Design a protein around this nucleic acid. Sequence first.
DNA 1: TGTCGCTAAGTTCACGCAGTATCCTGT
Lengths: 381, 431, 435
Amino acid sequence: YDPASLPDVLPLYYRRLFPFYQYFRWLNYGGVVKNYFQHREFSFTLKDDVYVRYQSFNNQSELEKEMQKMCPYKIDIGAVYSHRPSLHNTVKSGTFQAQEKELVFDIDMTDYDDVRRCCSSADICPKCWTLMTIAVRILDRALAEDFGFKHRLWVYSGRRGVHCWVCDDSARKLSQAERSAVAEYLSVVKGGEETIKKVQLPETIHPFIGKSLKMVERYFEKYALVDQDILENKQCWDKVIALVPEVARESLLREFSKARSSVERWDKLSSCLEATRRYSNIPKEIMLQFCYPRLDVNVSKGLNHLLKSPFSVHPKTGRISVPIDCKKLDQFDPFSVPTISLICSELDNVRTRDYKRTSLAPYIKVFEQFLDKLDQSRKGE
Amino acid sequence: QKYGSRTNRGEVVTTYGELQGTTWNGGSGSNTNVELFTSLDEPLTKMYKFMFQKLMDIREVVSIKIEELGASLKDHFQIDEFTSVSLPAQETVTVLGQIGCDSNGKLNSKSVILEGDREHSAGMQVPVDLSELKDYSLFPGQVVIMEGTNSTGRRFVPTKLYEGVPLPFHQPSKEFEECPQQMVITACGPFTTSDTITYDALKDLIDIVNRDRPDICILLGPFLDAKHEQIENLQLTVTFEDVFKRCLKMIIEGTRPSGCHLVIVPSLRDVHHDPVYPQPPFSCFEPAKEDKERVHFVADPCTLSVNGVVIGMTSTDLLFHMGAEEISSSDRFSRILRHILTQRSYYPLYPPNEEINIDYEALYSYTPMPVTPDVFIVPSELRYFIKDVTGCICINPGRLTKGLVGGTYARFLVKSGAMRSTCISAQVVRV
Amino acid sequence: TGDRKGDLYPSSLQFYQHPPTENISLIEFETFAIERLKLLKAVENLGVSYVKNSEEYSKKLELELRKLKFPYRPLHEEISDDVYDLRRKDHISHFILRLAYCQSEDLRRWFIQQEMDLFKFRFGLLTKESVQEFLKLNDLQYVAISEDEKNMHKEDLMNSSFGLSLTKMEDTEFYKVPFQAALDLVRPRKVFLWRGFAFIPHKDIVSIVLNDFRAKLSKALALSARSLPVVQSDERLQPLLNHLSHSYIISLEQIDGFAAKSFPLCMRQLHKSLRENHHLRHGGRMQYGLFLKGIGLTLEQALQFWRLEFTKGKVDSEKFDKVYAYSIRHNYGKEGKRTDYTPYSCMKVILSNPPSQGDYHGCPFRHSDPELLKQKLQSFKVPSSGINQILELVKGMHYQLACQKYFELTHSVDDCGFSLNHPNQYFAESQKLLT
DNA sequence: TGTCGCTAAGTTCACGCAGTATCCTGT
Ligand SMILES: Nc1nc2c(ncn2[C@H]2C[C@H](O)[C@@H](COP(=O)(O)OP(=O)(O)OP(=O)(O)O)O2)c(=O)[nH]1
Ligand code: SF4
Ligand SMILES: [Mg+2]
Ligand SMILES: [Zn+2]
């Protein structure tokens, strides 16, 4: 993909591929609340990194128009305000307030850098994507069981991670404090680059942590012991040794000198820890420190946060921010995600059904199913 | 001693109307209906918080009094426009105002000032020159309309003083057409001799009531005089409330045989009651269940309806208060009574006399005369009288006790629709 | 229910929502006010001295409640007349104290704190039955999970509540609450969440109740402060309510620096005038001397300062020792009645001797014309918006709020955080922020 | 019921005017 080719393709996509009808269905939420779509904030990033916010639109036609006119490189969705953002200058000071917004989570592979060995920075590979695969299951289950949020849209971020939009009416009316509470409840791996032991579970395992460890276990052997090989050599297993009390460290080292496979080393570590009881949760702390999602509480706390819009185009990879089907999560491949260049090649190879002829169709289908569920909830209620 | 040995007992000192027999008899309050005159304004029947008068409120009350009376008089006289009192007037102009004295002394013909209302004069005053007025009768607080000129802008010269306009009499309903004539015995305090606290005159009057069986007995205060020599020098061995309670028990229980409706009016000289005018009714005595329908604790002043006959009454010595201030060009009491009736207030004097405490909001609310009463009871230290002023029978029964010697009471007969002769006969009699 | 009782006082504890409507006597008013002031002061003292969960705290608070005859224990007998009386006391006294404790933010906070403490104690003395009764009468509608559902989530509940034993857990019943109300519990993961509801045991509940109470009470106090002008006109209740809170039941050189920064505008003006003319009339002398006593200036230090300042006014030093030395000694409670006179409060300064020509005492916000105050604020480099806000507050007769805004602007703090009711309080807060 | 006049020094008190000293207010 040639990023110099981005300015050539962006218009066509925004003209014949961007799913505006479903997009308006989403952000309009069945028209129940008046001025809901009209008070939504958008922000655009144009060529040469020119940023504009407090953009609002009257209806789908105005949005389609101004978007096709501007051809933005980035589209971010923001809060629904007390008035129309376009007229925020006209609103008396203090009377312009963000009132409702989806509850959103951003999981970014870059935040896992201190604990992955295959890639670094913005590089991803099939060996590390399983971490995202874990996160979506660990988090989404909580959101479906502990909090009872029923309408959850998971979206690929385009490069390094995934976003989650929780759109239940209750989740859209949550205050800042309630959002911060939700984020802290879901958050376990606490600390920066200056801390080595980032998980310190108490004697009692809270049911949520038990279910997160149960989800982790299913994948741990493949991710950590086979793929990541977190015990390949001394430079790496020194870390895991650094994560357990010194008392057994020596006892482990000799054992790790006689083990040929990291699965064997994990068995040995588990046996040694079991023999050594307050430390019976130490293996769980290691698993969490290598597998549990990291959440930027600043992303989810603030109501006025602008997050990458679904079906955006990644300025560098060119991939489309496509929704991820929860059931088919295990089959999701971030490298097969349609790029803008591929879908423009597909478009120029054959009115409201043009996208069905591209590789974008199944993802718009997943989005349509999610919107159908939202409509059913709006009606039934 | 002197009172007990008097020889003129029962003497009729004054008479008016149809001649009656030497003995008067009543219906014992059998076919009698006594109530408070039902007018637009509610009557004073309970205590009102006082001792808090804002000068602005007094100003407003006085101004609205002048304005309202002037509006009624303007409608009656078909006057076109009122002019500001203070402004100069080279030609004749009509001015509405109230009379007053330029100094603190008693009013005289050379000390008269006219103060206008807020609406037409911004409350400004002007001296008055009575040289060109041939006939006049003025007292302070009197609302007047005058035609005059002010050539110097500093001295108003009246040329005409418009006469007063009394309120219309009451047009009784036919509900009381078949009721008989009613007998009313009215007496005013003090009820005890200057040197005694035994209420001998009251006992004699109660005996008279039981003997004659009147239909109504109107007793006006004081009942425990503040000026009584025993009261002032603190020689009483019992509380004021106890003496007053004993007096009221004597009155009510002693009148049981007569079955006579008692109307008790307080006085500003009642040492045991709230010293404020208009005075609220007495509230420290609860009549027995057998006397509740007979006793009426009314306010000062009171307008009573007795089978359609409207009786106005006040304990305040209006005639003494206004006689000290009224100035005339050339009967003085008749003039003062006509002034009271035409001003349509039971106390039109402003500033009041030194012996009366006036709450001006209550005065505004409870001193307007609803109509011109058929009978007007005005006890006074002045001599007793029965006068006919503009068709109203004004009765001054004197006071039951005059110092050490016995005083007088009055008895009159009232029937609605008689002949306007609502007062058949009236007599001032000695105790 | 003897003569004039009713169902107006169902339960002992109440949220104090409905104001009383009765006609009480002045003696009853005063007795109730003073009694509840004693109760609240006892609560504050015991809270400072002891830990609120301590048994000593409970014993002493019960003793005080018994001594002052306030409702503290339930009675499963009926609404006895005596009990009714006590409850009536509580209900009226509370609102009276509201009228007393709504004038200044400081006072408000104090009141709220004491009230909350008392409420907590009383809740701690409620039997489960009574507790539920209360939770119903106020439409709090806190239940309650079924036994079958409890067995369904037995293990989850066991692992949710800290330090809960199997059998002891079997002996306990939980409540289902929306998670938006259990923020403080969910945030550290100390209560199980299932399908948007938290399962909260019977120790923590008081917390939620208290939260609700506090919200309500704060709102009420605001409203009361908004309805103050109607009460100030009642002289009978002014001496009490305005003063209930006060009812019996350093180097010389650095002074200038404080004058630059720490001194409130009143003291700044007084110091400027003193240094301009090296002489202050009696009122200025009294005010500034009391303030310098408050900051900590000792008798010797103050004597030296006043001597040095006045000697420059072209007067004999011995004249100073002859005349002003006695005044100084008296100001420090050294002679005469020998009383440690307290420094003037801003309220006194506002209501103290009215300054005239040639005077500089008093509160500038109250005794300075709006143009003069604007000029002075501009001189101090205050932002135009800040000056306008201060002027608006002054025009609103809330001079204390104007001084608080001054403090906020000068100290670069969004909120003062304290109810300024004493110039020495201003100086102490400034010193705390700076030093 | 009438009790002569005026003039003048002198005592005791009540106040200006100025000077000296001590004692105050608050929370
Ligand atoms: N009104 C009045 N005047 C008197 C009285 N005593 C003295 N005077 C006056 C008026 C006498 O003309 C004048 C003379 O007083 P004197 O004591 O020297 O006596 P007088 O000269 O009358 O006679 P004399 O010196 O004895 O030859 O004093 C008095 O008692 N009453
Ligand atoms: S509010 Fe108090 S500290 Fe501030 S200027 Fe006025 S008197 Fe001084
Ligand atoms: Mg001096
Ligand atoms: Zn990788």
